[PDB]
Design a protein around this ligand. Structure first.
Ligand SMILES: *[P@](C)(=O)O[C@@H](C)C(C)(C)C
Length: 372
């Protein structure tokens, strides 16, 4: 795999958690510091239906689905599947929200890097019909059998966009808060039966969370999700919006976010109508920071930036002018610094404080879009 290993000192484990089993329950992929480092065997896209969903998202047909599966169906991501959680410490927690057409497993470069630096990361799978595909179970017996019910991306008419995107961002924020509640409840001993039968014992998570040190991060639709979530749920102490797509947000949110917020943008995605909404968040009484990664495209934040070679990647807009590893390192290091500052971590992430100010040859402070 070309998805990069985490740069931090902790080995990384990965597992999935679904609870309850229904379409209203929480579904998430967990990346976490692992006790041991025995093999990097986590399957990147775990089910064929995700490839069918991606094909539908792309506006293609049945064969493209099968082509993607042939190419990527055995690809791994560098995490130890179901490895035991590293004991003896309480870890800060990030809840991560995916973009439109994505799903929980496609931001492993970010998740694994955060976990390698001592975070637990819960990457939610949304059931708002913004994921390419997702699944749930119709009853407990279906869960026991692995009899999945699949839900695919909803395509919208232009007349539907305003209303439905806002309904979806509200559902996404509810899902982020619900995922947090699930993890915090497990942390404090709530007996939970994972709807998925996996070797990872969820009891390991008891007394494993630093409950004061909680952040929400997300890409594109997931960046709007960060803002909606912060506005509704003060358990999240700061947020990081990776190339946020601001369209779904209602006017009311902009004055309702007390927590610090960090916008990390690509150079090549942003446009004035979007940036002006980010600027609406700024106020002298609040901490807002913004950087732009030079030579990056919207896909630099997601794992498909590592799926292909340089030429094919550039042609398909999965890669920018900048090296994908260099771009994700900047995004991850700047994020770590921001998290250390606003969660009060006692790590060495402040070494990257200059990156929050965009002080690097591959960063622009603020944005190239000077709409004011
Ligand atoms: P945003 C438009 O929700 O981001 C998209 C393009 C993905 C990267 C596929 C999630």
């Amino acid at each position: 795999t070309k998805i990069p290993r985490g740069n931090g000192p902790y080995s990384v484990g990965c597992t999935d958690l679904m609870f309850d089993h229904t379409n209203k329950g929480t579904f998430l992929r967990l990346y976490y510091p692992s006790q041991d480092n025995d093999r990097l065997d986590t399957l990147w896209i775990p089910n064929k239906e995700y490839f069918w969903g991606l094909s539908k998202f792309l506006g293609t047909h049945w064969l493209m689905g099968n082509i993607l599966r042939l190419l990527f169906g055995s690809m791994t991501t560098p995490a130890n599947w179901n490895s035991p959680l590293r004991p003896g410490e309480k870890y800060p927690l990030v809840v991560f929200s995916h973009g439109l057409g994505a799903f929980r497993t496609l931001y492993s470069a970010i998740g694994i890097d955060l976990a390698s630096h001592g975070f637990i990361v819960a990457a939610v799978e949304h059931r708002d019909r913004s994921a390419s595909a997702t699944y749930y179970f119709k009853d407990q017996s279906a869960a026991e059998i692995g009899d999945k019910s699949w839900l695919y991306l909803r395509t919208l008419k232009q007349e539907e966009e305003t209303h439905i995107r806002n309904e979806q961002v509200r559902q996404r924020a509810k899902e982020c808060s619900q995922a947090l509640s699930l993890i915090l409840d497990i942390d404090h001993g709530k007996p939970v039966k994972n709807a998925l039968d996996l070797k990872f014992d969820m009891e390991q998570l008891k007394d494993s969370i630093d409950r004061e040190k909680i952040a929400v991060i997300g890409h594109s639709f997931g960046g709007a999700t960060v803002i909606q979530t912060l506005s509704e749920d003060q358990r999240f102490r700061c947020g990081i919006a990776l190339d946020a797509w601001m369209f779904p947000l209602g006017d009311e949110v902009y004055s309702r976010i007390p927590q610090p917020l960090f916008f990390i943008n690509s150079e090549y995605f942003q446009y004035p109508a979007n940036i002006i909404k980010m600027k609406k968040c700024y106020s002298p009484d609040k901490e807002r920071k913004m950087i732009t990664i030079r030579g990056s495209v919207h896909q630099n934040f997601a794992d498909f930036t590592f799926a292909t070679g340089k030429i094919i990647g550039h042609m398909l807009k999965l890669k920018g002018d900048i090296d994908s590893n260099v771009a994700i390192d900047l995004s991850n290091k700047a994020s770590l610094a921001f998290l250390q500052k606003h969660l009060g971590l006692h790590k060495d992430f402040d070494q990257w404080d200059c990156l929050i100010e965009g002080d690097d040859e591959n960063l622009i402070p603020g944005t190239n879009i000077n709409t004011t």
